[PDB]
Design a protein around this ligand. Sequence first.
Ligand code: SF4
Ligand code: SF4
Ligand SMILES: [Cl-]
Ligand SMILES: [Cl-]
Lengths: 37, 37, 69, 69, 857, 857
Amino acid sequence: NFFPVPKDADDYEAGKADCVREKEDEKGKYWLSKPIF
Amino acid sequence: NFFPVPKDADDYEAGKADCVREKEDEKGKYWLSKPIF
Amino acid sequence: QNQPHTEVGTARPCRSCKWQTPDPTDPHRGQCTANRHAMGGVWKRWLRDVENTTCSRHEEGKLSFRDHV
Amino acid sequence: QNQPHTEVGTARPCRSCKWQTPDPTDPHRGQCTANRHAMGGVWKRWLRDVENTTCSRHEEGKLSFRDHV
Amino acid sequence: KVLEYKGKKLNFTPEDPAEETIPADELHEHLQKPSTARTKRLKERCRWKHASAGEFIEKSVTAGIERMRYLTEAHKASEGKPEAIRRALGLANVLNKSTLVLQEDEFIVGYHAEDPNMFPLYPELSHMAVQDYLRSDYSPQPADEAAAINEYWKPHSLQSKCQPYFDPADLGRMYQVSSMEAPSFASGYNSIVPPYETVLEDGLLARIKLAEKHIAEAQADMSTFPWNGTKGLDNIAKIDNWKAMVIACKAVISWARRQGRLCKIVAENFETDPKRQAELLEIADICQRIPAEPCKGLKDAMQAKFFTFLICHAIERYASGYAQKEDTLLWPYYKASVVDKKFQPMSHMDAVELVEMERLKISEHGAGKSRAYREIFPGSNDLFILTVGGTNAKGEDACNDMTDAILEAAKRIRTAEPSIVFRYSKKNREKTLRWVFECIRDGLGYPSIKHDEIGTEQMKEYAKFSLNGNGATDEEAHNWVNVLCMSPGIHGRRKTQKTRSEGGGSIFPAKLLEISLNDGYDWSYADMQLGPKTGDLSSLKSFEDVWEAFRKQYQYAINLCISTKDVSRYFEQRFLQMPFVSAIDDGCMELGMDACALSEQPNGWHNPITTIVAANSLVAIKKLVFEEKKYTLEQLSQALKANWEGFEEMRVDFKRAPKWGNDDDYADGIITRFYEEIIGGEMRKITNYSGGPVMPTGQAVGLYMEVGSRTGPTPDGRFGGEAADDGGISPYMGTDKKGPTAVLRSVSKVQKNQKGNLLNQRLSVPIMRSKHGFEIWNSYIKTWHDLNIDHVQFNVVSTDEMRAAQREPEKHHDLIVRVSGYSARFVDIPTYGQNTIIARQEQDFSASDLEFLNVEI
Amino acid sequence: KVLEYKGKKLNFTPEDPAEETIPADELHEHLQKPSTARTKRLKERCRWKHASAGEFIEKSVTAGIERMRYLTEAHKASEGKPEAIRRALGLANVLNKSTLVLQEDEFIVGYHAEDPNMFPLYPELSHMAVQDYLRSDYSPQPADEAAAINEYWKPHSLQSKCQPYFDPADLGRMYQVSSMEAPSFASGYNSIVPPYETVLEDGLLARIKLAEKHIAEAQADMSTFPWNGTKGLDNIAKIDNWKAMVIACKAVISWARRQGRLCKIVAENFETDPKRQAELLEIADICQRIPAEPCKGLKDAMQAKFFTFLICHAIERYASGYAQKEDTLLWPYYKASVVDKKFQPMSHMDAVELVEMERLKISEHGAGKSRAYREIFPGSNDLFILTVGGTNAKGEDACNDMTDAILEAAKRIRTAEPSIVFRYSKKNREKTLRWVFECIRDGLGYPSIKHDEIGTEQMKEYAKFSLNGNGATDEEAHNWVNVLCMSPGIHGRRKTQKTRSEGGGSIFPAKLLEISLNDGYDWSYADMQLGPKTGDLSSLKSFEDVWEAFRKQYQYAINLCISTKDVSRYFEQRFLQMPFVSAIDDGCMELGMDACALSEQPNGWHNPITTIVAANSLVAIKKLVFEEKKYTLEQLSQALKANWEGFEEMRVDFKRAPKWGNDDDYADGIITRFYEEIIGGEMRKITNYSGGPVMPTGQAVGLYMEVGSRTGPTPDGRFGGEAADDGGISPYMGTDKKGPTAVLRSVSKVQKNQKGNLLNQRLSVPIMRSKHGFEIWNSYIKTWHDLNIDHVQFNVVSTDEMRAAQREPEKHHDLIVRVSGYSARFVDIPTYGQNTIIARQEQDFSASDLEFLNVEI
Ligand code: SF4
Ligand code: SF4
Ligand SMILES: [Cl-]
Ligand SMILES: [Cl-]
């Protein structure tokens, strides 16, 4: 899942987005957000 | 021309030698000594 | 021969022995924990080299944390 | 047009002109020595860029040291 | 059960009548009460990352590679730039590119590696530690990249910078961790006291604006006619440090806000419950404002503190610890939220829940520390010690309702970490003492208790050596916390300890004693020369000769211990700058200096561990070899070399010789001198980087186990490889035969040349859990305080229950015990260590004990 | 021809009757007399490497790549190591791997690049300078490797380290070399005074043994109980510097001995004449012992000095210059060889020959300096200025037979370099004055003459500012040399100037004046803002306003000039350490400090060049615009902007206004104030790295030509692009109309706030070459000395001969003339520069001139 970085964000650069994915293991559910282009 | 470095020289290392060649141009004659292995 | 001794290119290095755990600072070194006393002491021996050392007590494997110090 | 002026991708850059000699510090810059006075002055002009500047006095070539400052 | 005292019969029946019949061996499985359904859930699914015996307990815990990868990329790209700026660029790249993590049910959010089961590594510190990780089951992956990374950093590593200034034989000796702890430059282990106060009350945007102003002024200074080259060049390092601070702070803000954006994204795209959606947006807003801006309420403060903790202890650099004065730090924000309701209005129980959540986040903080430091804190993630209580600038009570919220959260959620230190003063309100006792009587092992006045006096004394005459003021000297387990240090916006190179690191008297009797040669562990050749057995013709041999072994060892720390300091400030930490220190900011360079409050110390084994050994040597001449030293030495086999009658003689902790004159006269004249007296001759003395903080963590296993048989009666003593000044397990107040009397005799000393005591469960428990404990503490004793901490746990947890660990998950300076999950401790805790004497109080304590019922 | 003086008729017929009929236009082609067939041969085949107009005169002269290649290889391999050690490893790799050169007929042997037509480059200094070489016909080859090398060094270069601490607009202004010389960090240009005395009398083996001892002591210090971290850490930088010294010295010995082995190999395998074979073995033996051991004779000393020169000026780092007190330095060895015959027995004429050979080796030393520095020394390889004469520690005559051998060698061999400075005292023996005059009357242009007492006093004054209170003692203050052309500095085993960052670099009043009249804007050369906006034309309502505008332009410029030097100093000692130079400085060796870090004798200066154009311009402005109000400033400015076209009558008015050098009150009152109050007075407000003041050394080299060409028309009457004045304090060419003693009277008026000032004068050939020449010259010098004038140097050359050499350069190869502070081969100077020398007034002496000089015939 691909979410373009808000253009007014401190870390905005052209073409930059947060890749967000949901995971779940024996302990529980979580979300990871990695910056991509 | 290949001259093995004297084994008691400060710069002696195994297999090291001075390559010495004579050159001459419009100004005059000279000799170059480059270390090789 | 039941004490650590050099044996170059041994098939049974300390590194693979269940009694060995790596040195606290330098992973090239090891700790032999084989000398276990009836009163509970774990009387370790320092291993200078875990690739080329062995002894007769060598046993391939890995102890759980429960059985180490 | 007999004074240095920008002309992007010119066939006749200052860099190749006999009147040009490179800047003393930065070889991207140049010195135009074309303005030579009858009383001997060599009234130089500084060149910001020698690849994309030219003028009508452009003449390909190289002066010997004798004719420079 | 029943005791007669001053013409009354005291009945030690439990306060909760239900406990009369709960089997002794399962008591602690009944005590947790998380304040909300949420914190109950968070605990049940907690991603603990305990390590013992050099390994992680759980297969799922494993190293991350992102930090390694992005630090390397930045380092290659920044070649040629000033080092402080290179360091800021490294942190920024790590923060800019890191995968961030959000977990279900969290309110305090954030993490320090790319996955909640992971932890980061530190190739810039110790190349050996990384190599050890690469050889483990929990290696970063892909292994080939990680290996290439470690090879890239090796010539640049702190370890590689420091090693050339020492004799290789000396480093080999230290690296064994038998007589000396390995220097921090070789392991990467470290500690820090972050100036949290600055972040919470200024925010980072203000720090940036401040550095920018300093930079503009310095550049103006450099262009002012007439230049003075003996002054104007000072601006270069200042400008470099300030520019680095700006880069670091901007990156931290950006990272916090990106964490915030992940909450927003999950709320809008993943989370289906409107309740959690609203909560996630509330967290997203906090992260947007904090730590960029000043904190306004308690939720702000808690999140600002956690973010600051992640940068200072995990991301910018590894540092053990959780040092902070948590009640005094959070009080203004508690007051704003809970009392005045001015921003983020909350109930006291809401505050208790927020603290529970903090304890659970710390319980999930896995530490990328080296093999040695995965050995010596068995049953925990790492050391996390926070401080509460004590006194304020005017010497009045510092306890408050935030202190009580912190203590109640600990009692309720029952996590082994973070541990708590309570600074005890006669000023401290009873309402808060009662909460301290609720934790202790439940067997948590904390709060440990520190003597408030001793610590405060200590801060005043060190302040006098300040190199720029800006040590703690008399009022500031009341502002102190333990840095790791035991040693006081200043907290606040300025003058805090920035590195373990200032103080910390250990030295091991038991091993030093052993090699003293063998001319410096370690025959039993490493089979090599371990210390100086201080004299063979025949040259030791008197007890004074034995004493002097130990002295020389100790002098040689402690000199290496401190000099290796000061060399590390020299290079940390030159190549391991911490521009984020510098930016939030008022002194660093003001002077344009790196956090490791500037040292306004000296705090030099080193840790004697296994002291009482050495001391008991010396006492027995004196009595049996030299006074009574029952055995020659050659006879002792032959016995020792046999691990006493064939010599059991000699062993039992040495075992029964007078021992520390029995208020016995013979032992205590020798051992008091040993502490004061050698352990403290010799160390204090050394001056560190900061220009103050170095004094001992006696303690033990799990090193009393690891060093025990590397130490041969000793004249106190140990067989080879048995545990050493458990504290800085505890009786050796099972040798205190005169009860709890005899122990206090021994311990009180050591009064000179100490920085602190850890005392472990274990109290009878029925008494402590009876209705008389608080009164007896409060009297114990009052008496302990009058005797001018530095420290005490308590186990309150039955042997039955510990043995049951050994047999059936899966039925005893909530059993927590005190190890030494920290608490642990008992079933996560190796059997060897568990047995040392069971062997600690469970103390009962006789009526003469109670009279000595001036107990009133 | 004939002059009447005190009732005698003086006849100015030449001393050699043959010269009566030798055409005036070929005189100097008759004067060389090399002392031996060998030095005649060496001169005829001399590999001169003259540069003019930014290029080398000869196509055969071209850059080498070996130094670049081997420095790079070492730098990559040494990542992580301490910088001082990295620098030593770089030099060692260069020395270990360099091709060495032996030429026919040489006795003094050695070279600094891989082929006798070549010279080395310096990618560690200025990336721009290397890029300029890559764009030239004399690029190092292969070009692709050289380019890769420059890209590798760029982020590490001294230029890249220093630029970030300055406003980019300020650097752009300096880099133009119009109002300010570019800072050394941007060009790589530099200078040094090597402690030769240490090498010759100790040898390098002793220095090594000394550093090794310091290291052993420092390591012992660090392991001594009890450690003190406020002291013991000082050993780290010391040990690093000493280890670096050892690496450097061992490499230098090895390189010398390998040079020696090449002589042996040629003798045994290539050379067929038994005479030369024996000589080659004699040289081989000298190279084996020297510089490892102390020198024993003159041949030893000469070869030790040349090797030291190559390391300090070319191989370890680029440095212009040849500073040394050559007669005092070599005297002990001359005495041993020539007088006592104790080792290497030799005749005085043998010594003269050895000096001739030295002059020829220096004449072959090509310099890998940047484009600017291939522009401003037209007709020479580089600046090479040695010093002789003066006084000893007791204030007595320092002249001796070695001085005379050095002067006779110069007169005989007629090389333009090295140039000579003669320190003149009334103490100096006539026998040696006569040799000084033999050189001057032959038109060599040197010895230039420096005032001995002024320089010695100066050394005492600077010594007072020493940062470690170890400046020159009163006796040591007599031990001085010119560093490059003009400025005194200490020579000896200790306290010598190590870098041009201490003192050197120029500033250009003529350009500053021009932009003063245009609100800081340079309309004529660069078309951009060049200085501060000090006020438009209408705001300049009085002469005082014009004066103040210049003042502000000068203050802005001189502040950048010194601050850029001090920043360079900061980084040189941190990343450009010179461990070989450190090892041969007694202070560096003793304190374990780098040569650029330690500064025991301050010597701050900067060079005003084009001063008299500015000064004459100001005088004319005052008289015509403000006093007589003949023209408004708007009228002047309109004329200037027209290059005076249409305004010739105005130009001639400004040209004929009073001028410096005519002993005219109106001009001289204004110009004296200008020197003392602005040029010196403002500069002296600045303090440099070494903690002393910065004072002006007025001079010109070839910058008076280059800056002239970048300067517009000025109110002294110049058209745009015409040359500036030729000295620090010379009358502008052709404006001194009152004779030679009027010039002395003007010049003598400037007495405050100067470090030195270069005076060029040109004397009539017939008088100087007549039998009355010496008497008139000796009287001139005595009078010049009484007037307390700092400096004077002389051309003695007919215009006929210079014009002939312009027409037919191939017939005038041996014509040498004085430029400014150095001498040149006239036919190797561009026509523009040649014409400025022809325009210098050839001075005749009237009988009133001779009376003023108190001449006695
Ligand atoms: S092989 Fe022998 S010496 Fe090695 S670890 Fe195992 S038991 Fe110890
Ligand atoms: S092209 Fe024109 S401006 Fe450029 S160097 Fe030649 S003459 Fe000068
Ligand atoms: Cl601690
Ligand atoms: Cl000079």
